[PDB]
Amino acid sequence: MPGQQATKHESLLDQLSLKGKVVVVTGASGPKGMGIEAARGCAEMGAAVAITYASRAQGAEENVKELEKTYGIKAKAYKCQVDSYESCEKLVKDVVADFGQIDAFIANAGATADSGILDGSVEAWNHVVQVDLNGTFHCAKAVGHHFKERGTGSLVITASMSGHIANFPQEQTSYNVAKAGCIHMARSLANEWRDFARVNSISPGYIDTGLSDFVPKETQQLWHSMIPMGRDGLAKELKGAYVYFASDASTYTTGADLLIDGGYTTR
Amino acid sequence: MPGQQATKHESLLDQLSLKGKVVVVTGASGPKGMGIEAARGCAEMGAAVAITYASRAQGAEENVKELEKTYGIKAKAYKCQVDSYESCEKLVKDVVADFGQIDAFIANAGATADSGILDGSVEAWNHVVQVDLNGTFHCAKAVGHHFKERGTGSLVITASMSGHIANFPQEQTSYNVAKAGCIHMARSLANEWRDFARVNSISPGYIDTGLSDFVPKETQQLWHSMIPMGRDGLAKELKGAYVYFASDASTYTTGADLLIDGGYTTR
Amino acid sequence: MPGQQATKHESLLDQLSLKGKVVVVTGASGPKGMGIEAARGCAEMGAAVAITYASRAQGAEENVKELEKTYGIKAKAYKCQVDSYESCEKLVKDVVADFGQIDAFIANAGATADSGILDGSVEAWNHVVQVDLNGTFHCAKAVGHHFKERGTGSLVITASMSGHIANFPQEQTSYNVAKAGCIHMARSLANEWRDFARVNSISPGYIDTGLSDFVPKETQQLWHSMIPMGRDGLAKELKGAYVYFASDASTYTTGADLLIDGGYTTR
Amino acid sequence: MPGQQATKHESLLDQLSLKGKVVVVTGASGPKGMGIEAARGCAEMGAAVAITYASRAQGAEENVKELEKTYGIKAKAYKCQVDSYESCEKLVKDVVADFGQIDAFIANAGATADSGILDGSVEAWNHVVQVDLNGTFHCAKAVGHHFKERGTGSLVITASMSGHIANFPQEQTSYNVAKAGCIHMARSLANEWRDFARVNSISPGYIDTGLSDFVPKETQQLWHSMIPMGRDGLAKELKGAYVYFASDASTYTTGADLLIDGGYTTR
Ligand SMILES: [Zn+2]
Ligand SMILES: [Zn+2]
Ligand SMILES: [Zn+2]
Ligand SMILES: [Zn+2]
């Protein structure tokens, strides 16, 4: 296929449609999160979804049942540990052999950091870099070969506003550094796969996935004052961007980054 | 307080739906320009569109008919010269009087340059900055007052990759400077309107709007070889991004920028 | 085409030297402002300096005197209205007449904004843009013609961190937008003038030039908490960067921006 | 923890003076490399210098000798492999024992890639990221603990324009991604160390250090055409920036990045 061409559909609803297409999402281990929302969004567009999980399948199992019943499409859960290449490589092979192909890939690897560079050990640093950065690298290289053989494809990497600025007052340089590298990874791969696939990243700000309770009320109040919209976001506010990049509504966008932080980076 | 809240919808389709909402597009007036595509994408989502033209009206009148028969929505053409604040103030006052209110405004100040600031005159500069920068300011300020009075709103300014980088073959700093100011104006206003409205921008690259012949067939050759995707972009590949920022599919994203240059700003 | 070559000096001290060279600074009008500090530094490196003033002859004249007796170099003040292209074209003409040339030009003209685009009038907006954006453009175009004729030059425009983010809580979009245009103006001109001159920008964060009394004590504290260094900057903390860009100590750096904001933009 | 205060000096020369200060450069071990240039510049300002090497002990030994003889300062070489934290931790230890302190640390990791993600193996990726990314982390973490104890310091990390864009001819995503992380590491640490030290980065473009023969001639012309200055930079054009960040001529700069690429990123 001589390079990537523009959508054949003049209709937005046909550009966004994922019918006849296969999309795979990483996290989606719980009925509440960025990965499950991306899964629901793509599914709503008639997409056959393939969500993965790290340790326990319970969460994925149900997400699939909920995905097939409410959207009436085909779905399946797979075990995948991004920190391991062979794991990712296995994911692709198994998803391709099951669904027959992979059209879009949503990668959301986000292991947090609990300290600064000095207070933290080396192990602490490597954990974040190995999962957040290298983990993204693993998924990309896994689907990359499949995209090259089909001459089509869309890789959406989930980065973070932490890849733009440094969070305060919590210190998490390792996370920021990993996420920043993730953003540029999108740019560089877009240029590398310029002949067959599109690559773009989403940089979420403070999105409440359901764990706010494990955070000091004062800390949250301190964050909201820094967020011009003065509130946390909800994962369902990302599905749009997720579907946008995965579908044919962005056949000319590649190497881009979309900020969704309620205007945080703006200040 | 309250102010700037998340979508009430979980369904992506519902978040994208513009039924019941009024969106105005300034560019729209040509056959395949960025403006008519935005109105097309918005109209397809069930929105009542108000498009504007600068001089001749034959084009926007025809577009209004097109929009009404292919999407069954109400639309009307208005004469507006972004360079004049009164024209924009009248534009807003008129649409609201004809449609009830404005839910989303898409600015599209498109005036190009033809030289550097040295070869060009002071007039040449004032032209670009007045139409592309101040003009966008006029539209923004004009609808902002409405948005504030209502307590809601979404402003989508059409910037350009030229606000990120400087096109090589041809010199056009005045245009580039104007567009960059446009990009930050979106982040700056997202923060000023953080209590009632969102503001975001799109930075298009080389999009073929139907003026291929008015550009040296030899200058384009260079472009085609400098764009990773190796081809011009199509206005129909921008409707997705326009609808995204105009609809409720992005209630937590404000002050962000979306590049659509086929990977050009990647190298 | 003369083309831009690397400094012929190996020694840093020699690269920083500005002996046998002429420099012009537009701010130098007060005791401890960014302008006068920019001049003192250049004069220290042994350079003839031309400073300008908007209408404060007394102050500038005092600056000229102190500059000579302390640096043993030639100095002279001129009246310049950056908002007027003729004023700038004149400034250059005069300087080239008295000093015989201009090797480096430091653009500095701050026209603070007193409100957001909604509270301010179109006039207010136009003034800030005319002085801050178009003003810088006027100095660039004025001196550019001279650099092109000499095949050598170095422009250093003083932007602001405000061109990167939006100050809080004070609203000043007109000021931020202008400064934003100033930053990309440096990038665009660096390319436009590539064959004969360098262009770069400095983005000052909160610097105290002796006017802190105009800002409420309560607002000063809010700012300091937002500055990781937790303090205001001093004009003398920018002279190194000004001299850095004005001298041969940066003959390969063009189209770059240097933030001196105590880390304010980091968050 | 005396807080980072403004330089006490008013003179730029005093500010730039590193007499009584110790600096350490990791690259320095060759004739005209970026590292040795950084050493030379600091040596010329009157600083005690310590350079490291990974294997070329001979070259380092001679640089020391040459350093002490022309500048009359104390210099010594140390073996240090940045990919090992223990080696870095030991570097800081020994230097602080021999020199008594460390005021400025210039980090540098030159490991390069020779293929993209798909062609390269997981090992090739890991190697670059470990040396380039984690290596810079190692250095930072090592000196950081010392800076904190002294309540003063300045870290300068050598990144690359590859952290901002993706090189066209060659495919080197691992390098690009790694360099990108370095840039943000500087921002992040600037904030984390906001109480005792300053952190900043330099992003070089095509800088010919000598190996301008191992590259095909036709390849050189292609790059040179993408560089506004149309030439490769020389290592001696970076000593200005290295000394700028390491000295008291930038006591308010932190979290800033400086591009020195002949305007390459401008386009
Ligand atoms: Zn472990
Ligand atoms: Zn005119
Ligand atoms: Zn570029
Ligand atoms: Zn910020």
PDB file of N, CA and C and ligand atoms in Angstrom, chain B residues 165 264-267, chain D residues 165 264-267, ligand 3:
ATOM      1  N   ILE B 165       6.294  25.757  13.771  1.00  0.00           N
ATOM      2  CA  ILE B 165       7.534  25.851  12.995  1.00  0.00           C
ATOM      3  C   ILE B 165       7.440  26.915  11.890  1.00  0.00           C
ATOM      4  N   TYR B 264       4.556  16.359   9.792  1.00  0.00           N
ATOM      5  CA  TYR B 264       5.537  17.368   9.442  1.00  0.00           C
ATOM      6  C   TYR B 264       6.339  17.932  10.606  1.00  0.00           C
ATOM      7  N   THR B 265       5.689  18.323  11.699  1.00  0.00           N
ATOM      8  CA  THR B 265       6.427  18.887  12.835  1.00  0.00           C
ATOM      9  C   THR B 265       7.188  17.828  13.617  1.00  0.00           C
ATOM     10  N   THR B 266       7.281  16.634  13.050  1.00  0.00           N
ATOM     11  CA  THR B 266       7.984  15.528  13.683  1.00  0.00           C
ATOM     12  C   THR B 266       9.481  15.550  13.348  1.00  0.00           C
ATOM     13  N   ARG B 267       9.808  16.024  12.155  1.00  0.00           N
ATOM     14  CA  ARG B 267      11.196  16.099  11.749  1.00  0.00           C
ATOM     15  C   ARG B 267      11.731  17.470  12.108  1.00  0.00           C
TER      16      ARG B 267
ATOM     17  N   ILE D 165      12.991  16.579  18.145  1.00  0.00           N
ATOM     18  CA  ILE D 165      12.514  16.066  16.876  1.00  0.00           C
ATOM     19  C   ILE D 165      13.154  14.735  16.543  1.00  0.00           C
ATOM     20  N   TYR D 264      18.160  24.150  13.250  1.00  0.00           N
ATOM     21  CA  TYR D 264      17.562  22.940  12.694  1.00  0.00           C
ATOM     22  C   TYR D 264      16.104  22.731  13.144  1.00  0.00           C
ATOM     23  N   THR D 265      15.837  22.881  14.440  1.00  0.00           N
ATOM     24  CA  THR D 265      14.484  22.699  14.958  1.00  0.00           C
ATOM     25  C   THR D 265      13.493  23.778  14.525  1.00  0.00           C
ATOM     26  N   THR D 266      14.021  24.886  14.022  1.00  0.00           N
ATOM     27  CA  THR D 266      13.203  25.995  13.558  1.00  0.00           C
ATOM     28  C   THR D 266      12.268  25.589  12.420  1.00  0.00           C
ATOM     29  N   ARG D 267      12.711  24.646  11.597  1.00  0.00           N
ATOM     30  CA  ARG D 267      11.913  24.200  10.465  1.00  0.00           C
ATOM     31  C   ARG D 267      11.060  22.986  10.775  1.00  0.00           C
TER      32      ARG D 267
HETATM   33 ZN    ZN E   3      10.871  20.425  12.551  1.00  0.00          ZN
END
